[PDB]
Every structure is written in C-alpha cells, then in structure tokens.
C-alpha cells in the first residue's frame, strides 16, 4: 500500500492510493497429491483517488 491523505473541511478524508496484492507464481508446485493446495488468489494492481 502507498497512500497520501488529505482532510476536507466537510469532515471527509481524501486519499491518493496505490494498492498491489497477490501471491507468487509457482510452477514448481508440480504436485498433484496436494489437491489441498493453498488457495490461489490472483495478482492485482489498482491506483486511484477516493473521498
């Protein structure tokens, strides 16, 4: 997370936001026997501003 916050007189907070999340791509986990794999989330990038 990378962020920059701002106070607005209306009692609102504005943030510039960069968010990056995920898990490491692992071809090496070749095993079939682990069908109980640790859950595959994606990889995601977002950048935006919100208030």
């Amino acid at each position: 997370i990378r962020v920059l916050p701002r106070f607005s007189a209306d009692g609102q907070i504005e943030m510039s936001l960069d968010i990056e999340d995920g898990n490491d791509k692992t071809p090496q986990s070749d095993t079939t026997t682990s069908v109980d794999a640790l859950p595959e989330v994606g990889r995601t990038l977002i950048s935006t501003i919100a208030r």
Binding site: R6, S8, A9, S16, D18, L45, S47
Partner: protein, 51 residues
C-alpha cells in the same frame, strides 16, 4: 509675506519627497478541495503529471 510663503512651501515640498508610501502584503489561502502542488499519478509503469 508672499515671498516667505512661496519659499517655505516650495522647500517643504521637496523635503517631504523621500516618504515612501507603496507597500506589499502577504495573503495566506488554504485549499479545501484539491491538492496544492503539481500532481503525479503513476500508471502501471509510468508517472504522469498535471499542472
């Protein structure tokens, strides 16, 4: 009388001429709804900047 008056007046006039009367002032103004500085966003691989 006339001569004294005219002389005194004309000397007074050039004496007071060093008086400086024009002056500068500082006004402070807070923005409530936007970032003051020149604003950078990062796209997936690139920064881009707005005046």
């Amino acid at each position: 009388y006339v001569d004294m008056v005219v002389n005194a007046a004309t000397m007074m006039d050039k004496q007071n001429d060093g008086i400086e009367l024009g002056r500068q002032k500082i006004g402070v103004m807070r923005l409530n709804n936007t970032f003051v500085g020149d604003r950078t966003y990062n796209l997936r691989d690139q920064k881009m900047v707005i005046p």
